[PDB]
């Protein structure tokens, strides 16, 4: 509407806006100059399972209404988001330390996901199958799970923790919501607000703000949620999937986990092409976290790759020229530094070291990088490269291949149909192929189905 | 001829012992008597059986869909030929009666029947892309490596649900099974897929200790997806294992519930009963309304009364062997425990060897572990529920149930209690699916094209 939201530290649960009744007081500030953004008070154990229970409760009624009526809030969401886009932009680049340039990016993904998911109520259908018996119908009905728990990384809070809050709302299901410490209002605390202005009923999303640990496991264990769904590093995941599966409450876990994502690119591509996809992919626009380069075109690629990393200009992340920006906390930056000292005590060759300032991390490139060493192996969340020379084009796939976690690939050749036949033989789900979710993922994801088969005359 | 020398197991495309030095016997649930030993398997051999399997599965997955349904086609006719000598093995190993065991052998062949259908039927999606000159493709391939775990209780079947629709899309297999009854879970299969003339490597068998060795199978690299049916506490931590271990791999549980089985007041009484007693005696609460309960019960302890425990290679059979001594005490703590929670026993049959007679109880409550906890064994509880709205909380307290069972005369009132059940399947006054399969069983990979 007319003035920006206010009291962001107030949290939703179990359809009221108030504190957490931990008694201790969670501190956001912005990673650039460490100015204090706000003050939470954490919630209790009892403040999660007031959420949890609230929402089970509230839930059957919002699925009971028409497609129509829940479509409409989606709908409505889009409007907010477009009355409130500078807004929601300021709170990325001063919660996550974001680039104004990456923060647009941001809030177009989670605006994209909102009018996909006013799309899905009407589409949802359940199937009625032929049977042998005399007499009997078979009909499978496609329902609602009922309450699904969403833990949101500090990585890239609002966009993807929109990903599944906007399609399970819109499915009929109630969402609560465990944002990381970092950036709470960018997942979960902001998206609540839009919603209410939408007119989300009361109790159906509720956000739950306290520690990683201790309120983390009891989120995972608890029996309201019939699907718990996580997006982050693989060390978190791995501990999640241990409580999901390990517990004696067994909830279905769906779990995106980032790997090393390798960027290839073979003796045939376009050097130019390939220089400024990888510039864009691990600087600007985000997934790239290796560059396997056949040996005819590796040392020029590592030469004008270095000069015209030499040329990002790493600042205040505010401005719209910036290209790097400050790494979101301690902890995260910490660990990155741990790996630049690694790199270098493992043999990489050090093309370009721009240097830490504060939080502000300038890039590290390095060359001579092999399968075995750390900086290929593990995931990067930072302005942090290797480079890896491929004999031929077979050494190359057995490079990629490797990484054996990776969400995204690239391969570059001149040949498309060569690039398609090696796209094809790598291990990972998405490959694209020298660049210059799914309605149906979400139906199955976020709905169940129940068989009901009648017997009559 | 029948089948010879079945001890053997396959190991990375060959027939042999199993290397760990340790034989297991095999002997029939019935009378006692060993029907074969089969040395046990290294955990060298498991990594054998797996790294083969990674390395035949791409000329499997790169043959045609004609060439690999063709396989599936002629393992239905092997089925056909060697019928009774299938069933003959099901009542043998697992002590099931010859009633169950020729419906576990018409089952196992039309899910391999149906698994032929599926090569053809798989498919990619090209996407319209915004970017000016892009084209997005997206390839359904197989997984690659599926490892499957199978369970005592059906193991014929259970194994087979898995390994046709996985060999048919491409994947290879490799199957453990359950370490009662082996030949079953995979050795027979072995040998079948073998005359239908799978190629070698593709489907090993690695027989071995439930502990010890099971948690090596599903913590191994390799396989893509491991698929377990069974009970609840092994599949807990199968899941752990899986999530918690270094390497993560998705994993595909069905697990065993207590299954409710409700009778709302408006049903005839002579359907529920008699479903009733087929369903338990071919469902581990039944839940009655109160004003049909007394009548409800009285008529099922009649028909139980008459069903015929003895061996199960007679037709005439209905009840046979628990399938091992371990489990056959397990049932009989739980009916000594049955009566300390305090329930009224209706009617409870002696048990002689391993085969159990039909043990009923009446006036349980959600309380009782025998309306909680799962029993893989011929012993039902008897619930009262005061109205339609506690026995659907009655129905809903066990929360774990694979299926459910609803008795009304109106089909609205029972369609509208079914839906609002935790089940996921519900059967309303009686007397596996293709796109899940290949979902399940195949991966998607999306590319996306830069053209000019
Ligand atoms: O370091 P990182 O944790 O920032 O990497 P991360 O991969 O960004 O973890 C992100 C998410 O995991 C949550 N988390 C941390 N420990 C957890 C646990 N034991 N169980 C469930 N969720 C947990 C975090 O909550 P916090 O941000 O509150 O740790 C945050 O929401
Ligand atoms: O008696 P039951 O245990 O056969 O009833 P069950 O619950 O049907 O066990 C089914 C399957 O679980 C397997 N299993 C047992 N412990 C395991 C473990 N620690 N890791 C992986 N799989 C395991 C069994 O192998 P065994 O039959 O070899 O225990 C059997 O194949």
Not at 439 to 452: K, Q
């Amino acid at each position: 509407s007319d003035s920006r939201y206010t009291d962001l530290g107030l949290q939703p649960l179990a359809g009221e806006w108030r504190h957490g009744r931990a008694g201790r007081r969670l501190k956001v500030s912005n990673p650039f100059d460490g100015s204090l953004l706000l003050e939470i008070e954490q919630a209790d154990r009892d403040d999660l399972d007031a959420a949890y229970a609230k929402a089970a409760e509230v839930q059957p009624a919002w699925a009971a209404l028409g497609p129509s009526a829940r479509a409409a809030v989606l709908y409505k969401a889009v409007e907010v988001f477009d009355r409130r886009h500078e807004e929601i932009v300021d709170w990325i680049i001063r919660e996550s330390g974001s680039t104004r340039l990456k923060a647009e990016i941001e809030w177009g993904a989670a605006r994209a996901i909102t009018l996909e998911s006013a799309s899905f109520p009407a589409r949802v259908h359940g199937r009625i199958v032929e049977s042998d018996v005399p007499g009997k119908e078979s009909r499978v009905y496609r329902s609602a799970i009922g309450v699904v728990g969403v833990i949101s990384p500090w990585n890239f809070p609002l966009h993807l923790t929109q990903r599944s809050i906007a399609p399970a709302l819109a499915l009929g299901n109630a969402v609560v919501v465990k944002p990381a410490s970092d950036t709470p209002v960018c997942g979960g605390l902001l998206l609540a607000r839009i919603f209410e202005e939408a007119g989300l009923p009361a109790g159906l999303f509720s956000v739950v703000v306290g520690p990683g640990s201790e309120i983390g496991d009891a989120f995972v264990e608890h029996p309201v949620p019939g699907l718990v769904t996580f997006t982050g590093s693989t060390p978190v995941g791995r501990n999640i999937g241990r409580i999901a599966s390990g517990g004696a409450h067994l909830k279905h876990v769906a779990l995106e986990l980032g790997g090393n994502s390798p960027f290839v690119v073979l003796g045939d591509a376009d050097l130019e092409q390939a220089v400024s996809a990888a510039v864009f992919g691990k600087f600007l626009h985000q997934a790239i976290n290796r560059i396997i380069v056949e040996d005819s075109l590796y040392d020029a690629f590592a030469a004008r790759f270095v000069e015209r990393v030499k040329g990002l200009r790493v600042g205040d992340p505010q401005r719209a020229d910036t290209a790097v920006g400050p790494i979101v906390n301690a902890r995260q930056l910490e660990g990155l530094l741990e790996k630049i000292r690694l790199a270098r005590q493992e043999g990489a060759k050090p093309l370009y070291e721009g240097g830490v300032d504060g939080q502000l991390l300038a890039p590290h490139v390095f060359g001579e990088v092999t399968a075995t060493m750390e900086i290929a192996r593990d995931e990067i969340f930072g302005p942090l490269v290797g480079l890896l020379r491929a004999r031929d084009e077979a050494h190359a796939l057995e490079l990629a291949n490797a990484s054996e976690y990776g969400l995204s690939s690239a391969v570059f050749s001149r040949d498309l149909e060569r690039a398609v036949r090696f796209a094809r033989q790598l291990r990972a789900g998405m490959t694209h192929v020298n660049d210059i979710f799914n309605g149906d993922w979400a139906i199955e994801e976020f709905t169940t189905d129940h068989w009901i088969s009648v017997q009559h005359a």
